[PDB]
Each structure stands twice: as C-alpha cells, then as structure tokens.
C-alpha cells in the first residue's frame, strides 16, 4: 500500500543476498499494473509511483498498490572490504513479475497509472480483471 | 480547657483537634475559626484566654456531646416507636437506609453467630 | 479419574510393554460394585485373559457379600488359581490408579500361592 519504505517496524537481522524466481498473484481492486520482467523496486520508487498517481484528479478513488518490501541492503563508502557491510538505508523490495496497483474507481486509469510507470524500475503492462472467475 | 466540657485536645492544630468534640467535623470546626480569627496552624496551647475560650463562645450554637446523642436516640425512637419499616428495622439492628440485609452487613447487624 | 484427564502418571507403568515386554500385568479394576482383573500377555497377545468376579463359580452370582479385604481378595483368587500356569512366569498387577485397600486385598490375594515375584 504505502512504502515510506516504512521499515518492517524495526531490525531483527539484516542480511541475506538475493535470488528471484516466479511471480505469484492476480488482483484485488479493479485496475492493475502487472509486473513482468524481474527486478527489485528501490522502495523509494513505490513512493515515487504513488506520489505521481494523483496530479489532476483529487485523492479520489481507492489507490491500493500491494507489494511489501522486507529486504535490507547495505553498501560501503570509499573503503577496502572488511566484509561486514555498514547500515542498509536502501531497501530494495524483491519483485519478480507479480503486479500490484489498485484504482478502486470507474475510469481510464491506464493512461493514469502509466503516468507513474516511468518512475518504476522496469517495463510493466497493465491488465485489469475487474472481477474474478479466473481463479476459484 | 475543654471548651464544651471534658476532653482537652492539646498539642495539635486547631481545626484538626477542634473536631475532637463529639459534634463538629472537618468543615464545622473550620467554619468557626474563621469568624473567630483563630487560625488552624496554631496549637491550642499557642492560644490564650482571648483565643481558646473565644472558641467556646460560637460553639454553643450547635449541639454536642452527651445530650446531643440522647436528643437523637429519643428523636430516633420518636419515629421508631411508630410501626414504620424504619423503626421495625431499627429495633432489630438491620439497615434502615437501603442495604442488602440478606448478606454482607457485619458492622450493621453485629458479630457472627454461626 | 479419567474424565478430567488421562495425562497422568496412571499410564507411566502401563507402558511396561517396552523392555519388560513379556512382563504380563493384572490390570485390576475398581468400579465400586465389582473389581475385575484379567491377565493378558503385554500387548503382543491380548489374546489371553483371566477372570473378573465371574458370577458362576460356586453358586451362580458368585455368592459373596462384602467388598473389603474379604470380597476383594477372592476377587483375585479366581484369576490366580485359574491362571496357575502364568505364576512363575512373573506377571505383575498394575495399580491402575492407587495401591491401597481394595486393590491391595486384590493384589496380595494373589501373592498367596501365586504370581512369584
């Protein structure tokens, strides 16, 4: 929903490397933004994605984007490599190809959400199953 | 020395030790000192004839000690002699105000009779 | 009892089946009215047994009155003598719950001429 790359509340560890695979989802609201093409949101992106999902029309409509981070990173200044890794301060959500955005409101959204896609990290179609018989 | 007779409240604040009298309370013993000038922070001793005795003046306005109780015991009986529920309960040591005499009423009824 | 639970030491020894295995038990029962007993091979052969009050024995309803060390004792006697074979084989009587009075009279009723410990 939001990102604020709100930390997962606090710490409890902060390590692990990476590894991606396959997406796992459908829809919840009405309009959607399918992922496709592996990658990882800078989290800071989700903020940029949302901050842009409302310019002309008021905050009207229920925007619900649904992807949750949890993934500290960490980097190193201009130093050698004691292989520890300083703080994280980045947070790159793992995103393989799920797809998550919701614009609970009747309208044209395509040209609306795509207005924010360029902010995203990679390419991502739309597709919107207003409803449900796809999956029991 | 005892103001309203008997009991000499000594070595304590005025009002606080004034209530010693079997008739006045935290408020009453207080309301009297005002029109008496006598402060509360002053121990009865600290006072003088024109201080401690003066208190014994504006005290004859209210009823106190012995007869106060008697005048009440009788007044009580006045309404209690009548076959009213209150009396019928007053002469049995049962709550006449509005408590559950069916249980929990030690101080009311009296000791336990198992 | 068993109502409130079963998660009690009452089952601790009943698992005599392990190690002791061959070790046979008596079980013995309370049930205010009777006492029961029965003796079977551990678990590998429940296809064994003894006798409870077994009404028919001398009369028809096992003509006995009482339940103290009097009736309780005979309550075992039958399983005992009737199971003469098993005695030296070392059985065991499993308290079930408590080892006092009724079950005692039942257990010891066997110790006399039977169940060599």
């Amino acid at each position: 929903m939001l990102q604020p790359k709100r930390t997962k509340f606090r710490k409890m560890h902060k390590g692990r490397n990476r590894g991606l695979a396959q997406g796992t989802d459908v829809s919840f609201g009405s309009f959607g933004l399918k992922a496709v093409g592996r990658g990882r949101l800078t989290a800071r992106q989700i903020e940029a994605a949302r901050r842009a999902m409302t310019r002309a029309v008021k905050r009207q409509g229920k925007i619900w984007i649904r992807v949750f981070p949890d993934k500290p990173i960490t980097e190193k200044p201009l130093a050698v490599r004691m292989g520890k890794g300083k703080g994280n301060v980045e947070y790159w959500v793992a995103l393989i190809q799920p797809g998550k955005v919701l614009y609970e409101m009747d309208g044209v959204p395509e040209e609306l959400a795509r207005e924010a896609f360029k902010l995203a990290a990679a390419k991502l179609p739309i597709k919107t199953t207003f409803v449900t018989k796809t999956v029991m | 020395a005892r103001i309203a007779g008997i009991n000499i409240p000594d070595h304590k604040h005025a009002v606080i030790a004034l209530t010693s009298i079997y008739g006045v309370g935290k408020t009453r013993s207080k309301a009297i000192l005002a029109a008496a000038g006598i402060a509360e922070d002053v121990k009865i001793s600290e006072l003088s004839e024109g201080q401690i005795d003066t208190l014994r003046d504006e005290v004859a306005k209210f009823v106190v000690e012995g007869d106060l109780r008697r005048e009440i015991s009788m007044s009580i009986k006045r309404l209690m002699d009548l076959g009213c529920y209150r009396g019928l309960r007053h002469r049995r040591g049962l709550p006449v105000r509005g408590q559950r005499t069916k249980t929990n009423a030690r101080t009311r009824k009296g000791p336990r009779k198992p | 009892m068993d109502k409130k639970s079963a998660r009690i030491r009452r089952a601790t020894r009943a698992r005599r089946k392990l190690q002791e295995l061959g070790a046979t038990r008596l079980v013995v029962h309370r049930t205010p009215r009777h006492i029961y007993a029965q003796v079977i091979a551990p678990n590998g052969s429940e296809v064994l047994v003894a006798a409870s009050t077994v009404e028919k024995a001398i009369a028809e309803q096992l003509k006995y009155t009482g339940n103290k060390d009097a009736a309780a004792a005979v309550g075992k006697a039958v399983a005992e003598r009737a199971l003469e074979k098993g005695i030296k084989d070392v059985s065991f009587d499993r308290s079930g719950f408590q080892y006092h009075g009724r079950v005692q009279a039942l257990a010891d009723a066997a110790r006399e001429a039977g169940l060599q410990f």
Partner: protein, 178 residues
C-alpha cells in the same frame, strides 16, 4: 443437617414444578462456597495479617489455606511466592452450617443492609458474595479486632444458567431484598 433437609423437604419441589423438569437429580444442587479474604501486604505480610486467617479459620471452623501467589515482577512489588490469601472452602455437611448461619445470623449486619445483590450471578449460576468487614459471625472475645481484611465467599452450585438459578437461592434465603 440444619437446612440441608429444607431442600428435599420443601425446596426441591418448587423447582420440579417451576421451570419444570422430571429428575430429582436435575434439581439444582449446592456444590460449595469457598470464602477467602484478599488484599495482602505487598511487603508487610508476616506478623501483620497472619492473625488474618486466625479469624477465617474459626469463622468456618477449619484450617485456612492462606494461599500463595502466581504473579511475576510487573508493578506491585511481589515476585510470585508470598501467601497473601486464605481460601477455606466447605462442601461438606458443614456447608449447610455456614448457610443456616448466614441467612439467619447476620446476612443483615450493616446499617446499609437491604438484601442481597440481585445482579451478581456468575453468568451460569453461582453467586459471589462480598461485604467488607466486621465479624458478622461473632465467636471472639471482641476487644481485639484489627479490621481483618474482610470476606469474599462464593457459593458454587450446579445451576445450569444465570436466570435458571436465582429461583434456587430464592428458596430458603430469607434475606435477598425486594
């Protein structure tokens, strides 16, 4: 003895008709009571209030339990180990005793008496009594009271439900208000 008989003899059959079952077994029975005082001295529970059970003891006629404590560290300066209780329960014949010694003697002991709390049934049948002090059940020289931290007591019964009850208690109980 005293009162236990009022039960079968002039108490069972009222219930057998009112509410109306068919088994003199389903007739609402009275399990027990269990008294117990409470508030203990966080620090002072020792000489102070050990004579607190001395009362509940003879008041019932048994041996108090004084109980213990199941609370850890958090805000109250006690660490799950002190006595601070009494308990004392009666289900035996001596249960009817303390009964025939309640309704009759001092259910009505305080000037603020008027009956028993209507709305105090445990939700399924039993009722928790309370009251705050005095002895109400004299059997002491009475020149020694140290306002011994009151009395709770909660008569336990096989009452099926809240209102199913009431009519049970409401059948000897000469004290209960109106």
């Amino acid at each position: 003895a005293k009162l236990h008989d009022y039960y079968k003899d002039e108490v069972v059959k009222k219930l057998m008709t009112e509410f109306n079952y068919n088994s003199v077994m389903q007739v609402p029975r009275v399990e027990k009571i269990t008294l117990n005082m409470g508030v203990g001295e966080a620090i002072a529970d020792k000489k102070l209030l050990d004579n607190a059970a001395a009362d509940l003891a003879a008041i019932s006629g048994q041996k108090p339990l004084i109980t213990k404590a199941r609370k850890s560290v958090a805000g109250f300066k006690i660490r799950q180990g002190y006595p601070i209780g009494c308990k004392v329960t009666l289900r035996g014949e001596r249960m009817w005793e303390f009964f025939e010694r309640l309704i009759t003697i001092a259910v009505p002991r305080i000037r603020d008496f008027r009956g028993l709390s209507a709305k105090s049934f445990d939700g399924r049948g039993n009722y928790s009594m309370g009251v705050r002090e005095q002895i109400i059940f004299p059997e002491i020289d009475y020149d020694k009271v140290d306002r011994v931290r009151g009395l709770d007591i909660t008569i336990t019964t096989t009452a099926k439900s809240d209102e199913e009850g009431r009519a049970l208690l409401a059948a000897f109980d000469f004290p209960f208000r109106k």
